[PDB]
Write a protein that binds this ligand. Structure first.
Ligand SMILES: CCCCCCCCCC(=O)O
Ligand SMILES: CCCCCCCCCC(=O)O
Lengths: 259, 258
């Protein structure tokens, strides 16, 4: 008996709703509702990175979407990598509107491994990697302002197991990420046991992820245990690109289990 | 095998992203390819309201063309509306272009004006299905932008493409400013000695819209190119519906017009 669900997808750094296109097609084709959002200055969001130095504005598209969700409608919230921070805040604020939260290789901070610990670790795996670079729109006296993903970094660390056209698509769409201050993130993403902790949570491991190392991911899983950990073999960092059908099937299974 | 440089220019609502399959095939086969975002398209930083003049829309292509040392020739490909953009590039920098390719592109010339092909092109989009216009300049002024609707895209543009490409497009299409005919006519002026000196190939690719094909035949008849090629089974976005076939056709054209 077909039970219509509402999947809400949240991209990682530099990306946008566009990266989910294969997943969105499978969802809409099977009759489910799906909303792929562009966070601040991501995808075709009108804001420019330099215009939104506050993490609050990076996350606003999701928070605003969450706030206007209809009465009693519950969603399957999916966050990829950095998107993990966004859905975490959504979990703390609107825990009742989320049937189950899914972290796809996502930054998954919790009361005992906070957002800043997690962001500091994440930053080390992206800043300075291959051809990635930063800008100083506020002068040499201030912290770098934005991070720009390089094509070689994308091909090697992110899309190494995906169709080459997807790499081409990414290089024509990735945008800069404002380097939000740890202090700002810490005040925005604060999680509690009775709110964030009350939302069903599943973590999906990308077996061949060369962007976010195993040790970091298992540190988060260890210190902020999810209700379940699932795995997708042969997937690079962007599972929605390299292993779309498997991610789709897994998502449907997760939605049915926790509905 | 001689390395070539293809420069791809999209149509309304789109961006460099729509050529992803083509870009991929060109890079792996060893060629250079530049897929540009015109004003307020793809990830270009401008918003439609910020580029009310057609020259603002063409800016990314003209800047690109100007940055090219004259010895570095290119194969300039324009899709549909992108035809107007490459036509302008042809008039301004004729010598930097080995061959211009109009993929079902608006191909105005001396005997068929730019405003003429524009007005006709628009009738097929304005007021179609779920497409809609905005009025940022108030109710008593002409509409300011045109927004492509998902249904319009599904049945009129991507009807022969993988369904995921339709989804991709719905997450990326952006508004097109409704440029004035006066503006466009003044902006796209072509002469036989300049625009006319560039080798030109038109690629007909449309399948179940006979009127659309007539329009394409009209422009070909009024402004005859050096050659006309066809691609079967294509919807409005050939780079999506017939990628391998488009790639092959472009390689073939490039090798012929060196
Ligand atoms: C200080 C903020 C920078 C954090 C970088 C987050 C990296 C997420 C990983 C990814 O690229 O998908
Ligand atoms: C800017 C003139 C307003 C009319 C709409 C533009 C024509 C779009 C047609 C097409 O896809 O080729």
């Amino acid at each position: 008996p077909f039970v219509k669900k509402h999947f809400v997808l949240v991209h990682t750094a530099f990306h946008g709703a566009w990266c989910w296109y294969k997943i969105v097609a499978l969802m809409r084709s099977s009759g489910h509702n799906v909303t792929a959002l562009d966070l601040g200055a991501s995808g075709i969001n009108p804001k420019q990175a330099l215009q939104i130095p506050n993490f609050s504005d990076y996350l606003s598209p999701l928070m605003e979407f969450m706030a206007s969700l209809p009465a009693n409608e519950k969603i399957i919230l999916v966050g990829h990598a950095l998107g993990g921070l966004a859905i975490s805040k959504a979990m703390e604020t609107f825990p009742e509107k989320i049937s189950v939260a899914v972290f796809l290789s996502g930054l998954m901070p919790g009361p005992n491994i906070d957002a800043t610990t997690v962001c500091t670790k994440a930053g080390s795996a992206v800043l300075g990697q291959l051809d990635n670079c930063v800008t100083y729109e506020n002068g040499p006296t201030n912290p770098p302002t934005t991070l720009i993903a390089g094509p070689k970094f994308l091909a090697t660390n992110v899309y190494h197991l995906s169709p080459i056209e997807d790499l081409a698509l990414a290089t024509a769409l990735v945008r800069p990420l404002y380097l939000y201050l740890a202090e700002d993130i810490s005040k925005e993403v604060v999680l509690s046991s009775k709110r964030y902790g009350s939302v069903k949570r599943v973590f999906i491991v990308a077996t061949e992820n060369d962007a976010l190392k195993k040790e970091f991911l298992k540190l988060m899983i260890e210190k902020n245990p999810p209700d379940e950990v699932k795995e997708i073999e042969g997937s690079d960092h962007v599972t929605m690109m390299s292993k779309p059908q498997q991610l789709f099937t897994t998502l449907l299974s997760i939605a049915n289990k926790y509905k």
